[PDB]
């Protein structure tokens, strides 16, 4: 039953951790063991005879379940070994496992697939031969075939799908068609209302802004993440959301009218009710003050001052008052003589 499988998934998970502290993980024999595990995974007579059983056997086939579980064990074991021990992370050692990875990526179970996505990101840097390089290109197509069917991006398989997609654009020279990127931002943006499960999706957004890819949907994404920076309770989301928005604002082209609105938003969020919400805002204030053009500061100088003193002057949270003074403290020396 399903309850028992989850117990086994726990017990197997403990074994893999034990292998991490086991010495044989340091040897190359472990690689062959996983390779073995991969390829182990893949009438008149009755008229006379007295029959005394009224019960019938019920049809069931767990043989598929056995293969997937063992295959799941293989991928989890393999990824642990190569990451902990760098020397094994070599094309010559891992060439044999490529024909298994293509097979697993098509598997119906997603737990096995997610592990297949985990390993492939580790090997994305690693150079490979002509036949063994196609898998990275195919997996890029396959993850789309997941975001194809999947209703909501806030799924374990979809979330990891964006993770591999991010590393795909960051590292592999090949890049996907702009239209495919345009759609994916389409699917991410609705589910972004609930950021607690979109952490990986954020990192993928970070990957695009690093490469400076131009898409219409990024501008809307920038609008949404800015709200998440100040509204969401979770610290971790507020961090990544602040970074991607901060990188977005400086790099891409924006109309001068838009620029004033973005900084206009930033200051009024300084008057956001919750202490955490405004606290993240000073983090963006601090990033503008520490790293910005003298002109941009000068255009914005007198304004940032009067907003900071307000929070310092009257605010319920003592910490925010102190920080606003600190922001003023580091902001005043950098001002021009006129400002």
């Amino acid at each position: 039953n399903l309850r028992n499988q989850n117990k086994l998934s726990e017990l197997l998970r403990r074994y893999l951790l034990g292998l991490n502290h086991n010495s044989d993980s340091e040897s190359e024999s472990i690689l062959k063991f996983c390779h073995q595990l991969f390829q182990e995974s893949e009438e008149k007579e009755d008229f006379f005879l007295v029959n005394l059983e009224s019960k019938s056997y019920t049809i069931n086939s767990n043989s598929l379940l056995l293969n997937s579980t063992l295959q799941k064990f293989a991928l989890d074991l393999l990824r642990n070994v190569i990451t902990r021990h760098r020397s094994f992370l070599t094309v010559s050692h891992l060439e044999g496992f490529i024909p298994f990875l293509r097979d697993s990526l098509l598997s119906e179970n997603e737990g096995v697939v997610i592990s297949t996505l985990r390993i492939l990101i580790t090997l994305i840097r690693l150079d490979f031969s002509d036949e063994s390089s196609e898998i990275f290109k195919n997996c890029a197509r396959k993850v789309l075939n997941i975001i194809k069917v999947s209703p909501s991006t806030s799924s374990e398989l979809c979330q990891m799908g964006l993770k591999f997609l991010s590393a795909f654009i960051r590292h592999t020279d090949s890049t996907l068609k702009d239209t495919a990127l345009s759609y994916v931002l389409g699917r991410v943006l609705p589910d972004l209302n609930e950021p607690s499960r979109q952490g990986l999706a954020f990192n993928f957004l970070k990957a695009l802004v690093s490469k400076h890819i131009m898409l219409p949907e990024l501008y809307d994404i920038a609008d949404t993440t800015r709200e998440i920076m100040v509204t969401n309770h979770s610290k971790e989301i507020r961090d990544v959301s602040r970074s991607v928005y901060y990188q977005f604002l400086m790099e891409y082209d924006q109309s001068k009218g838009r620029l004033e609105k973005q900084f206009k938003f930033m200051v009024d969020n300084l008057q956001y009710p919750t202490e955490s919400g405004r606290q993240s805002v000073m983090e963006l204030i601090n990033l503008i003050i520490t790293k910005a053009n003298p002109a941009l500061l000068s255009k914005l100088s007198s304004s940032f001052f009067l907003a900071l003193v307000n929070v310092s002057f009257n605010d319920d949270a003592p910490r925010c008052r102190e920080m606003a003074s600190v922001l003023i403290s580091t902001m005043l020396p950098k001002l021009e003589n006129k400002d």
């Binding site: 789309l144 975001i147 194809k148 068609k177 239209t179 495919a180 345009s182 759609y183 994916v184 389409g186």
Partner: peptide, 7 residues
């Protein structure tokens, strides 16, 4: 949108 990602 279902089609574009196919491409």
């Amino acid at each position: 949108a279902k089609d574009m990602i196919k491409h």
